[PDB]
């Protein structure tokens, strides 16, 4: 407990905030360290890495490990766990000759741009460049020579546009979509019935369940979702093999729309409170003289539905109330004082953090 406090000091000394560089080169040479330490040379590296990780307020985009008298990466292999987004690295003046060790760092340091292995024996190997380009996907410069064109590399690993949470053709549609969305959702949460004035006899509404589980790497994804209450009403043409049901699952008229509305769980949408958790798109729909409003977000499940297997069914897990992520699309037709929903298409899916988040 006492010992760690010193090492904290050494690191702070070796870190520069302006250049964002941590100089961990030549630890054997630092006089402060020799009096205090060395036969324990192996246990200091990972400890220092952990201590580097635990202490916030130091952000490193560059690390120097030149001349640490390492034959193998092992002692510092843990670096990948500490600064995974490291951009520059120098390992010069070291005795590393084999490739076996570096295999620990495959698919790690994905944002590494520069690498310096100038005086290390590996520089002799013919497969050196190839293997290094294999090991560090975004590497641009290797031993001070350019090995990848930043232009192409940038174009390849990025889409033409950075994602945005909102798109509106004109500001009017923006204000209108916002108003409609907030109001509709508040009503959808608290009293489903009131919404029925927005649907005509021709208006249609259906729900589609996406049973798909997002990748675990996705931040805050729900790896065990529960679509108990929804599965009965799901109108997913790809998933539901029953062709006869799909005809029935579509709800037309305020009556059937209300029935399905009662069939769905009671919810709460924090659009006003947590605006960053929602993305919306609105576009013109000339064929109906209207607009299309698509809303991607999440909602909390407060109450069981107002309305309501062969071998084994359990109400506890499958019907557990939990927040869900959703994609809802309203095809709306404007009138002077009022609006009518031509179509309402909902998608219910396991909760997952928005791709629009930054």
């Amino acid at each position: 407990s006492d010992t760690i406090s010193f090492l904290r000091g050494v690191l702070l000394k070796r870190y520069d905030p302006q250049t964002k560089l941590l100089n961990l080169g030549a630890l054997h040479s630092d006089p402060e360290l020799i009096q205090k330490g060395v036969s324990t040379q192996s246990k200091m590296f990972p400890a220092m890495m952990k201590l580097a990780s635990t202490e916030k307020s130091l952000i490193v985009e560059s690390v120097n490990l030149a001349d640490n008298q390492l034959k193998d990466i092992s002692a510092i292999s843990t670096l990948a766990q500490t600064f995974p987004n490291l951009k520059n690295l120098c390992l010069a003046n070291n005795q590393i000759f084999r490739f076996r060790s570096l295999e620990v760092w495959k698919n790690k340091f994905k944002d590494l741009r520069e690498l310096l292995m100038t005086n290390n024996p590996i520089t002799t190997d013919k497969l050196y460049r190839t293997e290094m380009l294999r090991l560090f996907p975004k590497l641009v410069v290797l031993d001070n020579v350019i090995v990848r064109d930043e232009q192409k590399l940038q174009t390849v690993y990025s889409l033409p546009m950075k994602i945005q949470q909102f798109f509106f053709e004109n500001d009017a549609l923006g204000q209108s979509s916002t108003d409609f969305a907030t109001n509709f959702l508040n009503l959808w949460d608290n009293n489903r019935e009131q919404l029925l004035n927005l649907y005509s006899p021709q208006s249609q509404f259906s729900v589609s369940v996406d049973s798909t589980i997002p990748p675990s790497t996705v931040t805050d994804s729900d790896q065990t979702p529960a679509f108990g209450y929804y599965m009965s009403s799901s109108r997913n043409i790809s998933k539901v093999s029953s062709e006869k049901s799909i005809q029935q699952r579509l709800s037309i008229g305020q009556e059937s729309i209300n029935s399905i509305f009662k069939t769905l769980p009671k919810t709460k949408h924090h659009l006003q409170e947590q605006p960053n958790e929602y993305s919306m798109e609105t576009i013109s729909y000339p064929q109906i003289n209207g607009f299309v409003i698509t809303l991607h977000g999440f909602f909390e499940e407060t109450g069981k539905p107002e309305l309501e297997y062969n071998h084994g069914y359990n109400s506890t897990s499958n019907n557990k109330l939990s927040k869900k992520s959703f994609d809802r699309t309203w095809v709306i037709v404007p009138m002077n004082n009022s609006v009518i929903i031509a179509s309402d298409l909902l998608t219910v899916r396991a909760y997952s953090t928005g791709a629009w988040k930054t």
Partner: protein, 162 residues
């Protein structure tokens, strides 16, 4: 009057699958056909909340500045809207990108037999389509009026930066 038909549903679903297949196809030759699906006079395209007025620019950007993709259809629902002469499709699907570092031509960013693509982790996609009912009559020329493509969730470990 409102249309509810299983046949039309099959047409719709399969057409969606065809569109995603068209998206995933890197072959530059077939691209020419892809543009045929979109209405040249009036079309509304959206990609990650970034608009596209005409399909050509969008598809050029897709062909050039986006790597080869692999779509996996997770969900589809559609509403045929009477009087509109059109139908709206709410689609949800998963996507994998070729994170080999090679574009559709197979050209590397490295300074100096067909290669296999290295698929990255899955991305979440929500796609809204406005199509003409004419597809029920085997007509696919300029049927796509609305194309709203947006990502709903992303994997952190992906090398692709949206």
């Amino acid at each position: 009057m409102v249309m509810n038909d299983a046949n039309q549903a099959q047409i719709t679903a399969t057409f969606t699958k065809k569109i995603l297949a068209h998206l995933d196809d890197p072959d530059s030759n077939k691209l020419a056909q892809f543009v045929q699906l979109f209405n040249p006079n009036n079309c509304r395209i959206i990609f990650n909340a970034t608009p596209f007025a005409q399909a050509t620019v969008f598809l050029q950007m897709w062909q050039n500045q986006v790597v080869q993709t692999q779509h996996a259809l997770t969900g589809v629902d559609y509403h045929a809207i009477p009087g509109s002469g059109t139908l709206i499709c709410n689609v949800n699907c998963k996507v994998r990108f070729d994170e080999s570092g090679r574009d559709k031509m197979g050209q590397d960013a490295t300074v100096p037999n067909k290669p296999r693509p290295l698929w990255g982790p899955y991305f979440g996609i929500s796609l809204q389509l406005i199509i003409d009912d004419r597809i029920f009559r085997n007509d696919f020329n300029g049927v796509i009026s609305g194309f709203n493509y947006n990502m709903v969730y992303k994997p952190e470990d992906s090398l692709l930066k949206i």
